[PDB]
Design a protein around this ligand. Structure first.
Ligand code: HEM
Ligand code: HEM
Ligand code: HEM
Ligand code: HEM
Lengths: 146, 141, 141, 146
């Protein structure tokens, strides 16, 4: 991804304000609520049939958290997303067979959750830097499909 | 068409938005131009900088359309009949771009209504914008 | 939203297919399982090998649905009623996958009808399949 | 992209047979009639309002030919699509701002044109290998985005 110095400072600065145990679980929960077909990959999580079920689901919360830490990993390695997500690429592509479009959709859900959490601090300029990050994470996880 | 208890969430949300649709229109546009620079090539005739007269005015046209769509949930194809014609036949707007504006609108709503934008509200507004986008793409099929 | 000329090109085209619809269904299914291996995870309960009794029997199901859809052009949602429900609520079929099968269906038709697969018929059939896809994904909206 | 030895042989064997002055022109032409928004990028090509107009347009034919040759370049550098398509990526992304989705659609349009031309010879297996190639070409051309 191509992020300027200002864009790097602004993304890292917003991310240290991110509530680690909250934002990931809200973003996964929201993806599962809004795009009902994504629920097929999370059979073990039990009840995902209502928003109240999804949003009060401890497995959704725990898995969300790990997903948010994986985004953070990418922020630490913006020059080498390919190498960072190489193993997860094989997991999502070769084992689970998640269609790569869903990586973009979840990336955009994270952008929505951040807006929700940060208000006017999540400016048009800052969102535009997270759009670069989120596109890069998606494309790097999709590398196993080319 | 949308479900009941979802048809409701749309109409409430636009009331909880109120007449901020014109402001959210222009902000979502700027979020789109900045977040997805490809989308800018459709407006080389408009000044796209923050707070320009043209983005403000066009944002108002987009906000008003969505407002009219919100009280025409049973008849979106007829309500957005002429607009679907314009974007396909005249403007040749790529179907992907509607997803991008729809996303920038949810971001804008979330950024202004942190307490109202629940997972369910989110879900219904997505389906509403999805339905709107489908009608606006209707004339390619 | 299907044009009168598109209604015609679809009618003639499925007048060429007719009872080949089952044979095209199964071929389009194999082309998809091989072209897009992600789509296989939806049928772990079928032998997906070429000419298997399950791919052939399911190919007939799909082909007969498209046959029926072709005869119900102003009526697609009601015509494909049980199917919209099934593919969304029950099967949770990712929206992307309907595009991949629609593509494979076009490849199949082209491969069998090179003289009749004009750019115009190509276009109309793409639009027909786009509407079927829309209907089959509609319970997500 | 990873094509097996057998797949590489099948793909090159089929490509030696494609009519270079015809198939690229037919593939560009069909894209333009089937997905009318793509005509946005070819406004100096004149009339593209009907199938007859597009399919009897010399500039569409000349340009399809160069597009088919560019795919051919990719065939002989399947190892390095990124480097092969790097400059064209700049052109398509930085200069023309073609949404990357259209690269996928033109790839699949060529695939249906190969089917039209070769009939039974374009088997499920050969298509699948050609799906690998066009997915690789599309992603290499989208590299300036991702
Ligand atoms: C930005 C994109 C994504 C990232 C960074 C990401 C991250 C991760 C990580 C770090 C793991 C391993 C967690 C562990 O070790 O327990 C994982 C597993 C998993 N992922 Fe993703 N993910 C992404 C998108 C998706 C999407 C879109 C889906 C499907 C809709 C999905 C489905 C799954 C499933 C089903 C598992 C294993 C579940 C389990 O063991 O309980 N992921 N992901
Ligand atoms: C939520 C989806 C959208 C809605 C509700 C919407 C609404 C509208 C409306 C109401 C107009 C009328 C302008 C007039 O009265 O002259 C318009 C025009 C226009 N739209 Fe959209 N639009 C949408 C999506 C898009 C997208 C995705 C693009 C491409 C990025 C786009 C590009 C344009 C352009 C270039 C015009 C003409 C602007 C002018 O010169 O006046 N629209 N739109
Ligand atoms: C043109 C698009 C499609 C049409 C017309 C269609 C039609 C059908 C029909 C007629 C059935 C049979 C239901 C019954 O037995 O009563 C069916 C079932 C099914 N469909 Fe599709 N379908 C389409 C696309 C897809 C796609 C894209 C997928 C996923 C990749 C999919 C996955 C399934 C599965 C897993 C079943 C159940 C099979 C079984 O266990 O009997 N379908 N569909
Ligand atoms: C399938 C992948 C594609 C390949 C391999 C490809 C190939 C090429 C090549 C080789 C050129 C340079 C031609 C020259 O030197 O004269 C070019 C330019 C161009 N491409 Fe593509 N292309 C692809 C997809 C697309 C798509 C999908 C669009 C738009 C929908 C597009 C729009 C253009 C335009 C407008 C030009 C400049 C034409 C001119 O000179 O007037 N390309 N492309």
């Amino acid at each position: 991804v191509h992020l300027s110095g200002d864009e790097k400072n602004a993304v890292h600065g917003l991310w240290s304000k991110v509530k680690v145990d909250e934002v990931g679980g809200e973003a996964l929960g929201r993806l599962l609520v809004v795009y009902p077909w994504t629920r097929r990959f999370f059979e073990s999580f039990g009840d995902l049939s209502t928003a109240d079920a999804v949003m009060n689901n401890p497995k959704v919360k725990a898995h969300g958290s790990k997903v948010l830490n994986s985004f953070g990993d990418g922020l630490n390695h913006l020059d080498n997303l390919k190498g960072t997500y190489a193993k997860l690429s094989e997991l999502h592509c070769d084992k689970l067979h998640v269609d790569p479009e869903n990586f973009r959709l979840l990336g955009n859900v994270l952008v929505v959750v951040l807006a929700r959490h940060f208000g006017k601090e999540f400016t048009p300029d800052l969102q535009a830097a997270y759009q670069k990050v989120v596109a890069g994470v998606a494309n790097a996880l999709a590398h196993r499909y080319h | 068409v949308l479900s009941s208890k979802d048809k409701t969430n749309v109409k409430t949300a636009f009331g909880k938005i109120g007449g901020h649709a014109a402001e959210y229109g222009a902000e979502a546009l700027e979020r789109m131009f900045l977040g997805f620079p490809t989308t800018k090539t459709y407006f080389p005739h408009f000044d796209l900088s923050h707070g320009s007269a043209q983005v403000k005015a066009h944002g108002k046209k987009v906000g008003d359309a969505l407002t009219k769509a919100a009280d025409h949930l049973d008849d979106l194809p007829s309500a957005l009949s002429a607009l679907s014609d314009l974007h396909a036949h005249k403007l040749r707007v790529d179907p992907v771009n509607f997803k991008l504006l729809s996303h920038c609108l949810l971001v804008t709503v979330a950024a202004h209504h942190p307490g109202d934008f629940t997972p369910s509200v989110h879900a219904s507004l997505d389906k509403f914008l999805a339905n709107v986008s489908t009608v606006l793409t209707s004339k390619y099929r």
